[PDB]
Every structure is written in structure tokens, then in C-alpha cells.
Ligand binder design. Structure first.
Ligand SMILES: Oc1cnnc(SCc2ccc(Cl)c(Cl)c2)n1
Length: 133
């Protein structure tokens, strides 16, 4: 029951400061433009200890399956090859991605009927809000 309140199908409804976050990450111009348009469907499910997060979008489709605390390989929508570790901290999913000596942290939390995603790269944060699809 660890992630019950995350499970479901979610649709992106707002994004703030995502271009600046992507710039901080190192995403190039064309990818930032096309990625910034997308309104993905995020589909979260749990089967035993395995959590799956899928993103269905007009830009890219992605999928990760993982066990909390256990590092895995991830290919991000912008085509970074990262090493990821996801934990639960006080009911927040905390996802750290490491690549090329860099690090970014993505937090996903339930707030009211929304799922709020905060993406942080150094001093730059983007907030992406999802509602149930
Ligand atoms: O909206 C969401 C929901 N869950 N995780 C994320 S991860 C942030 C992300 C997404 C797409 C691109 Cl292209 C880049 Cl650079 C980074 N974002």
C-alpha cells in the first residue's frame, strides 16, 4: 500500500519554469522546444515491490520500473543515460538521476487531488502539476 495514492493515470495540466530547468540540465534548443509543448499522461502502478511509472506523450514515451532504494538504469525523454535511485521520504517519491558527474532530483507528491512534480537542477526548480486523467 506504499504508493496507493500515486497509482493511476494522470494528465499534465500546468508547468512552470520548465525551459529554465531543461537549460540547467543541458537540454539543447530543439529538444527543449518540442519537450516543452508536450502534455504527457503519467501512468503509475504498483505490483508487489515493483513500481512502474510510464509517460505517454507526443514528444517521447518513457517507462521506468524500480524497487525503492535500488539503483537502476534510465534513459530519459531527452536521451540522457542516467543512473537513478528512487526512495520514499515522508510520503514523497524522491528520484535522483546521476550522469556525467551531474545530478538532478525529481520529487513527486500528492497534494489535494493533484500530483505535483518538482524538478530541481542546482538552483533551478520547475513545477509540473498533474490531475487525474
Ligand atoms: O512531468 C514529469 C513527471 N515525472 N517526471 C518528470 S522528469 C522531468 C523531465 C521530463 C522530460 C524531460 Cl525532456 C526532461 Cl529534461 C525532464 N517530469
Amino acid at each position: 500500500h506504499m504508493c496507493d495514492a500515486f497509482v493511476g493515470t494522470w494528465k499534465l495540466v500546468s508547468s512552470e519554469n520548465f525551459d529554465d530547468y531543461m537549460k540547467e540540465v543541458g537540454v539543447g534548443f530543439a529538444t527543449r522546444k518540442v519537450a516543452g509543448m508536450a502534455k504527457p499522461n503519467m501512468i503509475i502502478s504498483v505490483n508487489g515491490d515493483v513500481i512502474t511509472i510510464k509517460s505517454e506523450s507526443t514528444f517521447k514515451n518513457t517507462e521506468i520500473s524500480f524497487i525503492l532504494g535500488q539503483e537502476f538504469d534510465e534513459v530519459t525523454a531527452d536521451d540522457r543515460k542516467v543512473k537513478s535511485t528512487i526512495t520514499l521520504d515522508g510520503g514523497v517519491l524522491v528520484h535522483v538521476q546521476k550522469w556525467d558527474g551531474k545530478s538532478t532530483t525529481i520529487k513527486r507528491k500528492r497534494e489535494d487531488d493533484k500530483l505535483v512534480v518538482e524538478c530541481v537542477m542546482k538552483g533551478v526548480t520547475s513545477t509540473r502539476v498533474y490531475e487525474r486523467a
